Amino acid sequence: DQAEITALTKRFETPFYLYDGDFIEAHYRQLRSRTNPAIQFYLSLKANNNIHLAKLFRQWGLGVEVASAGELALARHAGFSAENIIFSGPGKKRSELEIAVQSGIYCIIAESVEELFYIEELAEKENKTARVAIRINPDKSFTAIKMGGVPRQFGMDESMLDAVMDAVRSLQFTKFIGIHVYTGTQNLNTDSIIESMKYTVDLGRNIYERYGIVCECINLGGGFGVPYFEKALDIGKITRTVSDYVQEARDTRFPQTTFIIESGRYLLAQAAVYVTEVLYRKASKGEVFVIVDGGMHHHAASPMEYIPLEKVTIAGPLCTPEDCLGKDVHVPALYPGDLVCVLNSGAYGLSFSPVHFLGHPTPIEILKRNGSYELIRRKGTADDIVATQL
């Protein structure tokens, strides 16, 4: 609603992120309703580090997937219980593993045998039983030319499962809880997702057949993409097919197994708009440039809507040609005071950007819900920048 947005800029200084909390909830509940109850959704915190948004998901029953001790802290700030937190990452420091073990979370998802040994040492030191899952890099490709999967820095190749399981079994203070497969972000190929998830459920079966172990948790990953430029995923097909496959596993060998589908982008991308005001308008060498008050330092990832036709380039306030929101775009003439709205800015936005580049204040974040507006992140200050320097 342009009228709503315009009215908001009178009370909140641009540039800012505006989140539609009503949409976030409806969008999530629609996904939840179509998915087998044995599958629990986990919010990927790296997609958006705002604890106020994370709290909403916590209240709805989602778990949270963190990738650092820092995110673990944010997750606790958001109220996620330890039993609903999993720790992923290819380069966890021992200090991070230490805090994770001390926190007694659902599980640390190990990505190397050496990591498993570190966890065991820490479990012994802390006199605790550390829960671990293993991230597997499938030896299968889900357009791909070569068979056998892709070389990745993440997890451990499926072919190394024997070595991995031998290690986990030898670590007396560690308990194996399951597996995790995540093939990448912004996946817009419906069948590739279904195939990967079914493959992961099958890996669970292989583990029982080869080791007699029943995975307590099978994390199917996800990487559900959202169209930015592109067709949307057939969420109905994914949820229906995977739910049926999971139920079959549930009705046989995995009656008490928790299945997880992780999501960052799909849950939040379309729920926010980045609102920026046009500051200046100029012509240069036959072209027209419109300079707005927001940019790369707030939304590096950067559809757009304009609030009051020509070829124009929309640039941010930074001193670099890279701060371009739109090059040679055709839109009605924009003038100082007009608002440029960047759509689908709810994921990989603020925290994905070089917030301190050129010293501009970080943007305000607003959450709209139940007919009200809540400030969920204050405007940054110069002191926020020098904090680590003084």
Ligand X SMILES: *Cc1c(COP(=O)(O)O)cnc(C)c1O
Instruction: Choose the one of ligand X, a copy of itself, none that binds residue 211, judging by a C-beta under 5 to 8 angstroms depending on kind.
Output: none
* Helix, strand, coil % over all residues of the chain, rounded to 5: 35, 25, 35
The site that binds ligand X (CB under 6 A) totals a number of residues, namely 17
By C-beta, is 204 or 223 nearer to a copy of itself?
223
Interface of this chain with ligand X, residues 91 to 150, rule: CB under 6 A: none
By C-beta, is 27 or 281 nearer to a copy of itself?
281
By C-beta, is 270 or 353 nearer to a copy of itself?
353
Strands (E), 225-303: 258-263, 272-284, 287-292
Give least dist CB 262 to ligand X, A. 4
Interface of this chain with ligand X, residues 301 to 340, rule: CB under 6 A: 319
Tell me the two tokens of residue 209: 């057949």
By C-beta, is 149 or 223 nearer to ligand X?
223
Give least dist CB 190 to ligand X, A. 15
Give least dist CB 1 to a copy of itself, A. 25
Alpha carbons within 13 A on the beta-carbon side of 297:
22
Of residues 9, 14, 44, 243, which one binds ligand X by CB under 6 A? 44
Q: 264 among the known binding-site residues? A: yes
Residues 60-79 as x/- pattern, contact with ligand X by CB under 6 A: -----x--------------
Nearest to 279 by CA among 363, 360, 342, 337: 337
Q: 89 among the known binding-site residues? A: no
CA 277/CA 320 separation, integer angstroms? 19
Q: Are 179 and 219 in contact (CB under 8 A)?
A: yes
Q: 265 among the known binding-site residues? A: yes
Q: Is 222 in the site for ligand X (CB under 6 A)?
A: yes
State the DSSP code for 257.
Answer: P
Q: 348 among the known binding-site residues? A: yes
Pairing of strands 364-369, 16-20: parallel
C-alpha distances in angstroms, 254 versus 57, 149, 208? Answer: 26, 26, 10
Give least dist CB 136 to a copy of itself, A. 11
Peptide bond into 15 cis (omega under 30): yes
212: left (phi over 0), alpha (psi -120 to 50) or beta: left
Query: Residue 136, class by beta-carbon neighbours within 10 Å (0-12 exposed, 13-18 middle, 19+ buried)?
Result: buried
Among the listed ranges 31-39, 44-52, 69-77, 99-107, the one in contact with ligand X (CB under 6 A) is 44-52
Q: 131 among the known binding-site residues? A: no
Tell me the two tokens of residue 275: 């609102």
Q: Can you give the three-state secondary structure of 88-139, one letter per residue?
A: CCCCCCHHHHHHHHHHCCCEEEECCHHHHHHHHHHHHHCCCCEEEEEEEECC
DSSP assignment of 10-38, as one string?
Answer: HHSPSSEEEEEHHHHHHHHHHHHHTS-TT
Instruction: Choose the one of a copy of itself, ligand X, none that binds residue 204, judging by a C-beta under 5 to 8 angstroms depending on kind.
Output: none
Interface of this chain with ligand X, residues 154 to 193, rule: CB under 6 A: 182, 185
Q: Is 48 in the site for ligand X (CB under 6 A)?
A: no
Give least dist CB 338 to ligand X, A. 25
Among the listed ranges 13-21, 40-48, 209-217, 285-293, the one in contact with ligand X (CB under 6 A) is 40-48
Q: Are 151 and 108 in contact (CB under 8 A)?
A: no
Instruction: Choose the one of ligand X, a copy of itself, none that binds residue 286, judging by a C-beta under 5 to 8 angstroms depending on kind.
Output: a copy of itself
Residues annotated within a binding site for pyridoxal 5'-phosphate = 223, 262-265, 348
Residues annotated within a binding site for substrate = 265, 348
Q: Which residues bind ligand X (CB under 6 A)?
A: 44, 46-47, 65, 88, 182, 185, 221-224, 262-266, 319
